Structure 1
Amino acid sequence: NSGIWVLGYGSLIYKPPSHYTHRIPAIIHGFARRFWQMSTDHRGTPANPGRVATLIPYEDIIRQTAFLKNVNMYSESAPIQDPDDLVTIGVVYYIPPEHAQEVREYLNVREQNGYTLHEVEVHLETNREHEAELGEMLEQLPRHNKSGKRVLLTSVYIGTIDNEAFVGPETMDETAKVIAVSHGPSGSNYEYLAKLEQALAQMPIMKETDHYLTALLETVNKYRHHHHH
Structure 2
Amino acid sequence: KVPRGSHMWVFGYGSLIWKVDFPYQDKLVGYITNYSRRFWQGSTDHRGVPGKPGRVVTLVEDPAGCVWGVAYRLPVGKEEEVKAYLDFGQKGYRTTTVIFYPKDPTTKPFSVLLYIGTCDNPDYLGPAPLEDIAEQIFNAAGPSGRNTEYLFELANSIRNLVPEEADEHLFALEKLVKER
**Same fold, judged at TM 0.5 (above):** yes
Work out whether residues 99 and 112 of structure 2, in 8 Å CA contact, stay in contact via their aligned partners in 1: yes
Q: Which has the higher contact order (CA 8 A, sep 6+)?
A: 1
Change (3 A) 1:48 1:158: same
CA distance in 2, matches of 1:170, 1:162: 18
Equivalence for 1:120: 98
CA distance in 1, matches of 2:173, 2:98: 25
Equivalence for 2:73: 94
Work out whether residues 22 and 82 of structure 2, in 8 Å CA contact, stay in contact via their aligned partners in 1: yes
Work out whether residues 17 and 103 of structure 1, in 8 Å CA contact, stay in contact via their aligned partners in 2: no
CA distance in 1, matches of 2:172, 2:149: 16
Change (3 A) 1:23 1:88: same
Equivalent position SS for 1:86? strand
Equivalence for 2:124: 166
Aligned-residue identity in percent:
39
Select 2:11's aligned residue among 1, 7, 12. Answer: 7
> Runs of 5+ in structure 2 lacking a partner?
none
Equivalent position SS for 2:6? coil
Equivalent position SS for 2:136? helix
> Runs of 5+ in structure 1 lacking a partner?
59-82, 132-137, 139-149, 225-229
CA RMSD of aligned residues (A): 2.2
TM-score by length of 1: 0.70
TM-score by length of 2: 0.87
CA distance in 1, matches of 2:35, 2:85: 25
**Which aligned runs of 4 or more in structure 1 are off by greater than 3 angstroms?**
205-210
Q: Specify the code of the residue in structure 1 equivalent to 2:42.
A: M
What is the Cα deviation at residue 207 of structure 1?
8.5
Equivalence for 2:175: 218
Count of residue pairs the alignment pairs up: 176
Work out whether residues 56 and 160 of structure 1, in 8 Å CA contact, stay in contact via their aligned partners in 2: no
Bigger-Rg structure (1/2):
1
Q: Specify the code of the residue in structure 2 equivalent to 1:116.
A: R
More strand by share: 2
Work out whether residues 122 and 154 of structure 1, in 8 Å CA contact, stay in contact via their aligned partners in 2: yes
CA distance in 1, matches of 2:136, 2:18: 22
